[PDB]
Structures are given as C-alpha cells and as structure tokens.
Amino acid sequence: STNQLQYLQKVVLKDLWKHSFSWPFQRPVDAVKLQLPDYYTIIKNPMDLNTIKKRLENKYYAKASECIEDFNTMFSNCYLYNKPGDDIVLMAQALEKLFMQKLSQMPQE
Amino acid sequence: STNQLQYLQKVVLKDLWKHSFSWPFQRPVDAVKLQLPDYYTIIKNPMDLNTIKKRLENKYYAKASECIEDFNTMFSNCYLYNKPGDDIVLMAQALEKLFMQKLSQMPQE
Ligand SMILES: CCS(=O)(=O)Nc1cccc(-c2cn(C)c(=O)c3ccccc23)c1
Numbered sequence: 001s002t003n004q005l006q007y008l009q010k011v012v013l014k015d016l017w018k019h020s021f022s023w024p025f026q027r028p029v030d031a032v033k034l035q036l037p038d039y040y041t042i043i044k045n046p047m048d049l050n051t052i053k054k055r056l057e058n059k060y061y062a063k064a065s066e067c068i069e070d071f072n073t074m075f076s077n078c079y080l081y082n083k084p085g086d087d088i089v090l091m092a093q094a095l096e097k098l099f100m101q102k103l104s105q106m107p108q109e
Numbered sequence: 110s111t112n113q114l115q116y117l118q119k120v121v122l123k124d125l126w127k128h129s130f131s132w133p134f135q136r137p138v139d140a141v142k143l144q145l146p147d148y149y150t151i152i153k154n155p156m157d158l159n160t161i162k163k164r165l166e167n168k169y170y171a172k173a174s175e176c177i178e179d180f181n182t183m184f185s186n187c188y189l190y191n192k193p194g195d196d197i198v199l200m201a202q203a204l205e206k207l208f209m210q211k212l213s214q215m216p217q218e
Pocket residue numbers: 023024025026027028029030031033034036077078081082088
C-alpha cells in the first residue's frame with residue numbers, strides 16, 4: 001500500500017496540482033468568502049487538494065483506496081453542487097480526466 | 110489494450126450490472142418516460158451501461174481509456190443532473206465506488 005500511496009503523493013497529486021485548472025481546488029471551498037449559503041449544508045464531506053496533500057504527508061491513509069476515495073469525493077462534490085455548463089465543472093472534468101489517466105499508470109503493487 | 114478492454118467487459122461491466130443498484134443505469138435515461146424536459150438539453154452526452162456493453166461487444170473502443178471515460182461520463186452525468194441527497198445519487202455513488210475498486214485490479218503490462 002505504501003508504494004501506491006507514494007505514487008499518489010509524488011505523481012498524481014503533483015501532476016494534478018501543476019494543471020492550469022487546479023487553482024479552485026487547492027484549498028477547501030470557502031462558502032462564506034464565496035457567499036454560498038447552502039454549501040456546507042448539502043455537501044456533507046468537503047474535499048480539496050490541500051487536505052489530501054496534508055493527509056498523505058501525515059500518513060493519514062492506511063491504503064491507497066482511501067486516498068482515491070477522497071480524490072473522487074472532491075470531483076463529485078463539484079458536480080453535485082454545480083450544474084452542467086458551469087466553468088467550474090469544465091475545470092473539474094479536465095482534472096478528473098488527468099486523474100484517471102495517472103491512475104491507469106499506477107504501479108500495481 | 111485488448112487485455113484491458115477485455116477486463117472491462119467480463120469483469121468491470123459484469124460486476125457493476127449485478128450490483129443491486131444498477132437498474133437505473135441499465136438503459137439510457139428516457140427523458141420522455143421520466144418527464145425530464147431539460148435532460149437532453151443540459152446533458153450533452155448521455156451514457157448508460159447498455160451503451161457501453163454494446164460498444165465493447167462491437168469492438169467500438171480502440172483503447173481502454175475511452176471506455177473508462179464513458180463510465181465516468183455516466184456517473185458525472187448523474188451527479189450533474191441531480192442534487193446531493195437524491196436517492197439516485199446514492200446508487201450512482203455505490204456503483205462508482207465498486208467501479209474504482211475493480212479498476213485498481215486491472216491487469217497492467
Ligand atoms: C481555492 C478554494 S476557495 O473557496 O478559497 N476559492 C475559490 C475561488 C473560485 C471558485 C471556487 C469554487 C471551487 N469549487 C470547487 C466549487 O465547487 C465552487 C462552487 C461554486 C462557487 C465557487 C467554487 C473557489
């Protein structure tokens with residue numbers, strides 16, 4: 001599991017962060033700053049790239065599947081809160097496609 | 110690759126289909142039957158388990174990544190159209206969890 005978690009930190013997370021569309025995902029959605037009155041009510045488990053980064057650095061995950069769940073939650077949260085056609089959805093879809101590509105190259109340990 | 114498309118058909122597709130929550134995804138969303146006046150307007154590429162199945166049967170995909178993209182489109186279509194807390198979303202999330210589990214077991218090279 002440690003080889004895979006290492007790949008998720010040094011390859012997947014790094015490459016997602018470098019992508020030009022990553023900036024809205026680099027910190028938790030700040031619903032007060034953004035004036036989103038229902039966000040915290042209906043998005044039960046907010047997730048973002050910095051929380052995943054900190055969890056990997058602190059060895060919070062026991063298995064790679066736990067970390068992959070958090071990546072997937074960040075994307076579906078975006079899709080669930082927003083609507084088709086929103087530019088934020090376009091950016092999430094670009095990162096999700098890159099995330100999916102890098103997962104395909106994960107060293108099967 | 111042929112090994113991976115092969116796994117996607119007899120392993121990933123078969124296990125998603127047998128899941129108790131797969132039935133809303135076994136045919137295209139019929140917006141007239143369900144009286145969803147905006148579905149075909151805002152969901153640009155509808156996708157379902159039967160479309161993927163026939164495409165795999167007909168050798169439509171040239172690479173496993175294109176079939177994986179259709180699976181992801183089916184899930185995000187559902188998240189985009191519906192709202193958090195909807196029961197349809199819970200079943201999509203259960204299938205998408207199973208999808209990522211089978212993906213981690215895909216034979217690499
Ligand atoms: C860096 C986190 S931030 O909250 O400090 N800045 C920031 C700036 C612009 C856009 C969003 C943003 C991100 N995501 C993922 C959303 O789903 C969303 C939904 C509605 C409105 C805005 C957003 C966040």
